Design a protein around this ligand. Structure first.
Ligand code: HEB
Ligand SMILES: [Ca+2]
Ligand SMILES: [Ca+2]
Length: 345
């Protein structure tokens, strides 16, 4: 059957027991009592920037293409966090390092762990998986491997296809993370502008809101990779805006609107896949029973809605197969999306 940890919990594999002490430590000292706040969002982002930096095409040509989910972004933070796509990630890397040192775990395992635990904090999240077995990187990733907000949809599709054999529909899946996300470094005048009106809730509001006609910048204009957004305080990036309207991806983008089961099943899958880049999944240990049970979305709303002051008339419909769903609109005046201030220091 199962192993029993010193704290009296039971697990599928005895090696998983050490992660309960990591869990308690980060929930209290990294995530401010298990919150879906700035440190959680940064930890989710960090998983992608560690993991996607792998390139089988470069290896085939005799060039080191990076080791994927290997902890390189932490081990070699002075190198990798100075790459422009990794802007702002040295803060979370620095917050995470003490825990890795204290608990004697691999940097790559800890990054995957912290991302899973972060998502567990966000109502609506899938039940996140956690596998161990990522040896420390011995070489930093090359630059040019992490997508930018100003890149073409073509080059982003190509990049994820190379990194993980991900198709263009799976690209849409992994962008679900922007449902619990804010932007600190794109607008030099303001930090913490969310991508959707519910950055604390893993829902499909990101997929709704990116489909709306953009009307204004939330702060300054003229920032590379930024386009007009539909709501005060919400930011929109060019890549997301284009993927939402591109004939290859627009139908998948819309499919998440008012479809919670598809959202969570697809994201659960793709997040695990990201955390196993550069690894042999058969060689890894399943420690998924350490991750907290995800919480349902509270309250009494339909799963997807238009934000207040928006209706079907504000949607730029892009899926030729299926009209955009006629959602309910939240009552009241158009409200400003509140910023998520990044960690002090
Ligand atoms: C994980 C998963 C994921 C994925 C896949 C992604 C994908 C992406 N993305 Fe992301 N992001 C994210 C998650 C993510 N993401 C998050 C979580 C965030 C937030 C952070 C904070 O809040 O801090 C972001 C954020 C972000 C930002 C902001 C930053 C700064 O400012 O610093 C940007 C620009 C981006 C982009 C992007 C792109 C281009 C792509 C393509 C693919 N993003
Ligand atoms: Ca890496
Ligand atoms: Ca959200």
């Amino acid at each position: 059957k199962r192993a029993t940890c010193s704290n009296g919990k039971t697990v599928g594999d005895a090696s998983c027991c050490a992660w309960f002490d990591v869990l308690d430590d980060i929930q209290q000292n990294l995530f401010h009592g298990g919150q879906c706040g700035a440190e959680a969002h940064e930890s989710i982002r960090l998983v992608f920037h560690d993991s996607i930096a792998i390139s089988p095409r470069m290896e085939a040509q005799g060039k080191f293409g990076g080791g994927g989910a290997d902890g390189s972004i932490m081990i070699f933070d002075d190198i990798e966090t100075a790459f422009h796509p990794n802007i702002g990630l040295d803060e979370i890397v620095k917050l995470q390092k003490p825990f890795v040192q204290k608990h004697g775990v691999t940097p790559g395992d800890f990054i995957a762990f912290a991302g899973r635990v972060a998502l567990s904090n966000c109502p609506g999240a899938p039940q996140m998986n956690f596998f161990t077995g990522r040896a420390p990187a011995t070489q930093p990733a090359p630059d040019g491997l992490v997508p930018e907000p100003f890149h073409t949809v073509d080059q982003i599709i190509e990049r994820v296809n190379d990194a993980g054999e991900f198709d263009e529909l799976e690209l849409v899946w992994m962008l679900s993370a922007h449902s619990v996300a804010a932007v600190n470094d794109v607008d030099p005048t303001v930090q913490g502008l969310p991508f959707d009106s519910t950055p604390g809730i893993f829902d499909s509001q990101f997929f709704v809101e990116t489909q709306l006609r953009g009307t204004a910048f939330p702060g300054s204009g003229g920032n590379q990779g930024e386009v007009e957004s539909p709501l005060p305080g919400e930011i929109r990036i060019q890549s997301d805006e284009t993927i939402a309207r591109d004939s290859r991806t627009a139908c998948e983008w819309q499919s998440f609107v008012n479809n919670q089961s598809k959202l969570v099943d697809d994201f659960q899958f793709i997040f695990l896949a990201l955390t196993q880049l550069g690894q042999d999944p058969n060689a890894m240990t399943d420690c998924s029973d350490v991750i907290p049970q995800s919480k349902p979305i509270p309250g009494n709303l339909p799963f997807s809605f238009f934000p207040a002051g928006k209706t079907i008339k504000d949607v730029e419909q892009a899926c030729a197969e299926t009209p955009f769903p006629t959602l309910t609109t939240l009552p009241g005046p158009e409200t400003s999306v509140q910023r998520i201030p990044p960690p002090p220091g």
